[PDB]
Design a protein around this ligand. Sequence first.
Ligand SMILES: O=c1ccn([C@H]2C[C@H](O)[C@@H](COP(=O)(O)NP(=O)(O)OP(=O)(O)O)O2)c(=O)[nH]1
Ligand SMILES: O=c1ccn([C@H]2C[C@H](O)[C@@H](COP(=O)(O)NP(=O)(O)OP(=O)(O)O)O2)c(=O)[nH]1
Ligand SMILES: O=c1ccn([C@H]2C[C@H](O)[C@@H](COP(=O)(O)NP(=O)(O)OP(=O)(O)O)O2)c(=O)[nH]1
Ligand SMILES: [Mg+2]
Ligand SMILES: [Mg+2]
Ligand SMILES: [Mg+2]
Lengths: 140, 140, 140
Amino acid sequence: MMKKIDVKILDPRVGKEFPLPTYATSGSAGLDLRACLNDAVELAPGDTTLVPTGLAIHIADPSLAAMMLPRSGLGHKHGIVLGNLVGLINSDYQGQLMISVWNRGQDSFTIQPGERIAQMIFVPVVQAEFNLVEDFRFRQ
Amino acid sequence: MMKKIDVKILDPRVGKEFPLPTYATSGSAGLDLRACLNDAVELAPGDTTLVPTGLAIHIADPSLAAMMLPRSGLGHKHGIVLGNLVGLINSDYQGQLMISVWNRGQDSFTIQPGERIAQMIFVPVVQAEFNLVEDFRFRQ
Amino acid sequence: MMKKIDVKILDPRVGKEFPLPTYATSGSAGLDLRACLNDAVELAPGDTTLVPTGLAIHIADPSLAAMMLPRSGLGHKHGIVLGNLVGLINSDYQGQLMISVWNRGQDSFTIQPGERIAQMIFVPVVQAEFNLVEDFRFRQ
Ligand SMILES: O=c1ccn([C@H]2C[C@H](O)[C@@H](COP(=O)(O)NP(=O)(O)OP(=O)(O)O)O2)c(=O)[nH]1
Ligand SMILES: O=c1ccn([C@H]2C[C@H](O)[C@@H](COP(=O)(O)NP(=O)(O)OP(=O)(O)O)O2)c(=O)[nH]1
Ligand SMILES: O=c1ccn([C@H]2C[C@H](O)[C@@H](COP(=O)(O)NP(=O)(O)OP(=O)(O)O)O2)c(=O)[nH]1
Ligand SMILES: [Mg+2]
Ligand SMILES: [Mg+2]
Ligand SMILES: [Mg+2]
């Protein structure tokens, strides 16, 4: 299912030196996000750093949201994941997309400019209206 | 996309002293969940605590689920995330919604009664039926 | 909402000694994935291990993806979660489904053959086409 989403380039390297996010195949669920940095950032074990993307999106449709996730290789092999675990991008958010990068492992890691460091999916969302009722199934 | 969801208030402070979850804007994807606690809980670095919400929902429609996520500020700045990372709420679950709060950082944190400590989204889900076949593309 | 999904059994114990993933109730959102192991794996605090499932799926429809999540009990009580936090399975992926199991806690844990160690949901996804525009709201 396809949707055009407005994007504003905030740093002129995005779409040039730092490619815009794209889908690798017709069947990819996520777009890889790249680090928009002037120089490498060394991220020590246990630490968190805020990585800019150099871009803003405006999903606009309240029936859609995005979710930011780690990439599986980085997470599994390097312990490079997100400090907020999973990021939620609201339809009315128009600020820069930021990546909270957390080193959950034991090895120092260099975040390089332009590196595909996380990924983002677009999922339909439903807005709940609560209906209060009196009455209406944590080894494993 | 909108859906009415049945909710049962389990603690009489919910909807009073502890506001019911709400969406901030017409374009918000998630509802913030509040800690239903009698007193603050001090959460040491690395530790996990189970926080009640004082409410139960019944999604009821098997085409919908909810996902509990950290809030980005708390996760990035304070290391206050979920012990199960992301929570999945099944359509037929009718128990109290519980929040596994994990301090993944290095600083002690006080969880206050009524604090917006996590968030929840409602997403469509598909139930898979497996079709066995003989035959039917882990730096980065 | 229901969909038949092609699955290939890669290890002949899957569907026999190691049951195929199933939904517990008509209202369950997720399928539990089992560890396809010859012997138990002892996972020390802080460590990550790659657990095979013995199966491959082919979602095939680019409007669908799967997400792998921790189980709430394991995550909250035992600190047994995913090293990549949340796994994203693309529609065109046809390899073995792998589980990055991370012990985020302080206690050693034994991963047993056949153990339900994670869960997976199928969610609709939308593929974004970016539309560049000049112009188009991080306690808490
Ligand atoms: O937990 C996971 C996550 C992914 N996978 C598989 C399926 C998915 O389609 C594939 C790629 O996932 P990612 O894009 O998150 N990983 P990465 O970007 O490191 O690999 P690639 O370069 O192939 O895209 O790996 C798993 O088996 N388990
Ligand atoms: O990983 C993320 C997560 C969120 N965001 C942006 C977009 C999202 O719409 C916005 C708010 O996300 P949260 O509601 O999770 N954070 P918080 O509740 O701390 O901020 P706010 O008070 O504005 O809602 O922050 C990112 O740029 N990266
Ligand atoms: O963060 C959470 C996650 C789950 N839950 C509730 C709702 C959900 O439907 C239920 C079961 O979730 P899981 O299947 O992830 N946990 P587990 O597999 O350990 O429990 P069960 O054996 O009942 O399925 O627990 C919460 O209250 N908070
Ligand atoms: Mg990838
Ligand atoms: Mg928020
Ligand atoms: Mg379960």
